[PDB]
Design a protein around this ligand. Structure first.
Ligand SMILES: OC[C@H]1O[C@H](OC[C@H]2O[C@H](OC[C@H]3O[C@H](OC[C@H]4O[C@H](OC[C@H]5O[C@H](OC[C@H]6O[C@H](OC[C@H]7O[C@@H](O)[C@H](O)[C@@H](O)[C@@H]7O)[C@H](O)[C@@H](O)[C@@H]6O)[C@H](O)[C@@H](O)[C@@H]5O)[C@H](O)[C@@H](O)[C@@H]4O)[C@H](O)[C@@H](O)[C@@H]3O)[C@H](O)[C@@H](O)[C@@H]2O)[C@H](O)[C@@H](O)[C@@H]1O
Ligand SMILES: OC[C@H]1O[C@H](OC[C@H]2O[C@H](OC[C@H]3O[C@H](OC[C@H]4O[C@H](O)[C@H](O)[C@@H](O)[C@@H]4O)[C@H](O)[C@@H](O)[C@@H]3O)[C@H](O)[C@@H](O)[C@@H]2O)[C@H](O)[C@@H](O)[C@@H]1O
Ligand SMILES: [Ca+2]
Ligand code: NA
Length: 701
């Protein structure tokens, strides 16, 4: 299908009645002149709702961009699938969301970089790329602010043109305003990251009072804090129910909306803290104190500007009945729910049950998860340090836990070097990740050279023994396709020493990422995972680029995001509920099945709306039951016979199967038969292909 290179729209979301411009980028590479038609067809679920055609002739090697126009139908909150057929030139797909309000079907991305060198054109391109490729309709702006308690830096009444954030990055006001403008141009919303309860160090000259603080004891001796490890930089924590702190920080939220032009506030927190006291020594349960803060915040935001009053709150460490889970999801006036998952919902099934709880508690508000894929894994192509070209250092095996046949030791003085000969299979960004040991008692440093040029000085953190390997020393660089040299040098001005195990081209595992996203969306949530210039999120610190997506995963993500936009009505509507009572059952011939996301099975998940019986098949054949870690390619299946049991209450008019894995998400209608036996009333068919994820939607009269 390689002639049709891109299919996309001008915006990420449309109001009913809007003109939608569908673009088709085509290039003739058949080796000789081509003449024919490009045929557009738009579907809402199983139903075709628009078709149109344009003739197309291209000389060998010739490219062009067609435009089809369409008016968004008048029914609000509907997703559409888009097919482009150009015959022998190939085909393509995209999707369209018609929604007056993104908080119904949020597709959340992020921006975390605000360099002054970034032009308005480049800011537009990075927003356009996410909007066009994935229909991202909201961006979380991460670490834009000057201080947590003084977000826009001013000299007198004048906004400073740049400022340094808490890690000393330079934030450009003009770059930030350009990005916000670009987001608004695609009908996106810009959400400002802000803490619920943080000031920075030395807060009293800003008129903030310790008497508004939360404390670790009843004598106001130690205020809860966050220690960034340099002996100066901290956050201090405050009581979200305190009316003075609310006054203070809600005014900063408002300033951010009105001055910077944000469309809402993404309210963050640090997560569970125990045995909390106010300044006067009253014992308080912090977990029930967010909801009153958030209700009040929503009130002043909505009063200030009903169009820029969006609000969510991070439920940190999400799990069924987790800390603050019930109080927030049930009582807080939020537009959608957001939760960062750590280690309390490690299996696919646990995480499914948590999403389900959030959906039920919130009255089927939208749910977005932050769930950093491959977080603990040194995923990617590995080059063993002991197999590299090393100067004035030699190999060893005398501390356990190394990969390969050993590691490089005593990397500790001027003239020492290790040079890796790597290959980039495609042009693009590469995360260069070093697994190392350092027990010198302080940070150690080395200079990084790529193809003979100095790129950065890198820091290698002190660990607690020499048998303690880490892989948090990394740097991302652009590489051309083919051979390169990556070199670490101990030069003048470097300090300490390291053991070096390996270099890895830090890469998100395509397989795990597809399974996790399928699981989440089939359960009823989306996933904040894409941001900046086509980065995927590796870590809670969003500017982290310790892993990169390769092209094969970028395509799978385009398909996935096309799929969750096109079928948003079947995945995320307030209609959509679990179909969990009745002993409902799926039988697959030749493969192990399971209803609870067991290892090495095809998982079925049962959902429904008033019109459809929906069955998701998620293919864990050949893989474990953990969602975050790396995975192998699933055992793909062909012509899989299936039979789905249904309440005798139900009669099924049609069987439809759509998958982001198959023909871009396009629905196929399947022939099926009904019957009855010992197991109850059933329907039966052949699934032609299961790779990662199939959604079966079956129409009921
Ligand atoms: O995402 C929140 C939180 O999630 C996980 O921890 C949850 C657990 O917390 C408690 O147990 C862990 C540990 O927590 C404390 O110390 C943590 C950490 O503190 C210092 O480093 C802080 C971070 O510094 C970098 O991040 C910079 C950003 O800091 C702030 O943002 C934090 C996050 O807010 C989230 O809401 C959001 O989703 C996320 O994107 C943000 O990154 C700030 O607002 C931003 O402006 C900054 O950019 C660094 O990159 C992070 O890794 C650090 O967390 C110290 O230097 C570091 O050494 C500490 O580990 C307690 O002090 C400690 O006692 C406790 O053991 C709680 O007990 C558990 O129940 C709960 O599950 C992550 O593991 C954690 O890292 C993260 O902050
Ligand atoms: O005590 C103050 C000094 O401590 C820090 O430097 C510590 C060492 O760093 C490098 O060596 C790294 C090396 O460390 C261990 O090796 C221990 C011994 O092993 C052999 O006996 C060897 O012959 C000796 O050199 C060494 O003492 C780990 O087991 C090994 O895997 C590591 O690679 C330097 O090369 C050493 O000279 C240091 O002792 C601190 O950074 C220094 O500034 C301080 O002087
Ligand atoms: Ca090794
Ligand atoms: Na897994």
């Amino acid at each position: 299908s390689g002639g049709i290179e891109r299919v996309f729209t001008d915006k990420a979301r449309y109001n009913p009645g809007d003109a939608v411009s569908i673009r088709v980028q085509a290039k003739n590479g058949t080796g000789s002149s081509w003449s024919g038609a490009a045929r557009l067809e738009i579907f809402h679920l199983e139903n075709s709702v628009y078709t149109s055609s344009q003739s197309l002739s291209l000389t060998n090697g010739q490219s062009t961009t067609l435009t089809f126009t369409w008016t968004a139908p008048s029914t609000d909150f509907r997703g559409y699938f888009v097919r482009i057929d150009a015959g022998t030139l190939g085909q393509g797909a995209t999707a369209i969301d018609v929604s007056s309000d993104f908080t119904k079907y949020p597709r959340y991305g992020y921006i975390s970089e605000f360099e002054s060198g970034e032009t308005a054109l480049e800011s537009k391109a990075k927003v356009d790329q996410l909007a066009q490729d994935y229909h991202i309709n909201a961006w979380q702006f991460y670490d834009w602010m000057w201080r947590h308690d003084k977000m826009i830096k001013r000299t007198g009444g004048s906004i400073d043109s740049t400022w340094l954030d808490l890690f000393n990055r330079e934030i450009s006001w003009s770059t930030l305003q350009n990005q916000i403008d670009a987001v608004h141009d695609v009908n996106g919303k810009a959400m400002a990251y802000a803490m619920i309860y943080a000031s920075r160090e030395n807060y009293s000259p800003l008129g903030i009072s310790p008497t508004w603080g939360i404390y670790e004891d009843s004598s106001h001796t130690n205020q809860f804090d966050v220690d960034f490890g340099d002996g100066s930089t901290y956050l201090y924590m405050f009581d979200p129910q305190n009316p003075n702190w609310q006054n203070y920080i809600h005014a900063e939220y408002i300033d951010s909306i009105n001055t910077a032009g944000f469309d809402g506030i993404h309210v963050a927190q640090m997560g569970q803290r125990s045995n909390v006291y106010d300044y006067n020594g009253n014992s308080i349960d912090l977990s029930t104190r967010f909801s009153p803060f958030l209700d009040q915040a929503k009130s002043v935001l909505s009063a200030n500007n009903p169009a820029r009053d969006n609000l969510t709150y991070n439920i940190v460490d999400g799990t069924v009945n987790g800390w603050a889970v019930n109080d927030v999801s049930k009582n807080a006036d939020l537009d959608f729910l957001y939760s960062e998952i750590w280690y309390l919902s490690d299996s696919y099934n646990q995480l499914k049950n948590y999403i389900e709880q959030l959906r039920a508690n919130g009255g089927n508000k939208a749910v977005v998860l932050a769930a950093y894929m491959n977080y603990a894994d040194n995923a990617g192509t590995r080059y063993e340090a002991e197999s590299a070209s090393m100067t004035n250092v030699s190999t060893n095996t005398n501390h356990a836990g190394y990969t390969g046949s050993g590691f490089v030791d005593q990397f500790a003085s001027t003239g020492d070097k290790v040079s890796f000969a790597i290959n980039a299979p495609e042009a693009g960004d590469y995360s260069l990740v070093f697994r190392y040991g350092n027990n010198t008692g302080a940070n150690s440093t080395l200079n990084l050279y790529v193809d003979g040029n100095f790129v950065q000085k890198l820091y290698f953190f002190n660990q607690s023994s020499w048998g303690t390997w880490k892989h948090d020393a990394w740097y991302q660089v652009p590489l051309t396709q083919g051979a390169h040299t990556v070199e670490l040098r101990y030069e003048s001005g470097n300090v300490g020493a390291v053991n070096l195990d390996s270099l890895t081209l830090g890469t998100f595992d395509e397989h795990s990422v597809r399974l996790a996203d399928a699981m989440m969306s089939a359960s009823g949530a989306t996933h904040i995972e894409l941001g900046d210039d086509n980065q995927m999120l590796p870590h809670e610190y969003y500017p982290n680029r310790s892993k990169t997506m390769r092209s094969s995963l970028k395509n799978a993500m385009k398909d996935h995001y096309n799929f969750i936009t096109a079928y948003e009505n079947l995945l995320f509507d307030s209609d959509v509920v679990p179909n969990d009572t009745g002993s409902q059952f799926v039988n697959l011939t030749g493969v192990s099945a399971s209803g609870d996301g067991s290892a090495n099975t095809v998982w079925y998940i049962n959902k429904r709306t008033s019109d459809y019986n929906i069955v998701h098949l998620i293919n864990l054949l050949g893989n474990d039951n953990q969602w975050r870690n790396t995975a192998s390619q699933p055992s793909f299946q062909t012509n899989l016979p299936a039979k789905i049991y249904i309440g005798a209450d139900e009669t099924i008019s049609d069987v439809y199967l759509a998958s982001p894995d198959l023909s871009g998400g396009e629905t196929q209608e399947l022939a099926f038969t009904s019957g009855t036996d010992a197991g109850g009333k059933y329907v039966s068919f052949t699934v032609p292909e299961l790779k990662y994820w199939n959604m079966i939607y079956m129409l009921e009269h």
